[PDB]
Amino acid sequence: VKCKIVVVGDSQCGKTALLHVFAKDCFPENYVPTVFENYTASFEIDTQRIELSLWDTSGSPYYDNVRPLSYPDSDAVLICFDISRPETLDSVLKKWKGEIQEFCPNTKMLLVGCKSDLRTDVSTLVELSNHRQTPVSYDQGANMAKQIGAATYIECSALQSENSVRDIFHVATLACVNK
Numbered sequence: 001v002k003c004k005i006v007v008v009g010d011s012q013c014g015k016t017a018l019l020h021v022f023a024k025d026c027f028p029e030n031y032v033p034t035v036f037e038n039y040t041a042s043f044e045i046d047t048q049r050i051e052l053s054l055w056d057t058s059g060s061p062y063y064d065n066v067r068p069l070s071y072p073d074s075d076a077v078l079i080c081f082d083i084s085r086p087e088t089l090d091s092v093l094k095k096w097k098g099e100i101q102e103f104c105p106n107t108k109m110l111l112v113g114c115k116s117d118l119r120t121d122v123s124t125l126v127e128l129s130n131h132r133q134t135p136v137s138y139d140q141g142a143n144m145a146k147q148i149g150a151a152t153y154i155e156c157s158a159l160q161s162e163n164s165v166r167d168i169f170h171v172a173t174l175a176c177v178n179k
């Protein structure tokens, strides 16, 4: 019936677009750095009505001081990274895991790779090669999920696949109700 899900990850990794496509099927036209947002409503998940409380947060270190205020009583935490920026994956390991482990010790964390569509975007690929990098590979992400002890690994593209975004929240809900 009710599940609280909080989304965290580095700035610009895709959190807000992920949440807006799910909650309104509306991809955000312009980018605005997030501080906090909450959207609480009844969603039809397959059949069953489930009341989700969705929390958006800041990826910026400058809000580290208040970010944890959103964590109490979370049923699932979606730790997100940007598939087009491998440094955001390192953050899941060096910062996000520790922060969730410290404030939501008993919560299920899902590792969510965002912007999967950028894996085939030439501009992205050229800029990454110029720094001797490639996008995070599927296997790289999955390996990071085992590394941090995440309940699962999943990927999406809020920009190009509404279904991929639906799948994120369906699995996050599953994580919630399985307890």
Ligand SMILES: Nc1nc2c(ncn2[C@@H]2O[C@H](COP(=O)(O)OP(=O)(O)OP(=O)(O)O)[C@@H](O)[C@H]2O)c(=O)[nH]1
Pocket (backbone or CB within 6 Å): 009, 010, 011, 012, 013, 014, 015, 016, 017, 018, 028, 031, 032, 033, 034, 035, 057, 058, 059, 060, 114, 115, 116, 117, 118, 156, 157, 158, 159, 160
């Ligand atoms: N190609 C692509 N770009 C995306 C996708 N999702 C988001 N973006 C873009 O990446 C930028 C950041 O997306 P947001 O969802 O606002 O980032 P955030 O993680 O919410 O950022 P903070 O609020 O600063 O933590 C925006 O310009 C988006 O339009 C995606 O699935 N594909």
Ligand SMILES: [Mg+2]
Pocket (backbone or CB within 6 Å): 015, 016, 017, 032, 033, 034, 056, 057
């Ligand atoms: Mg945001």
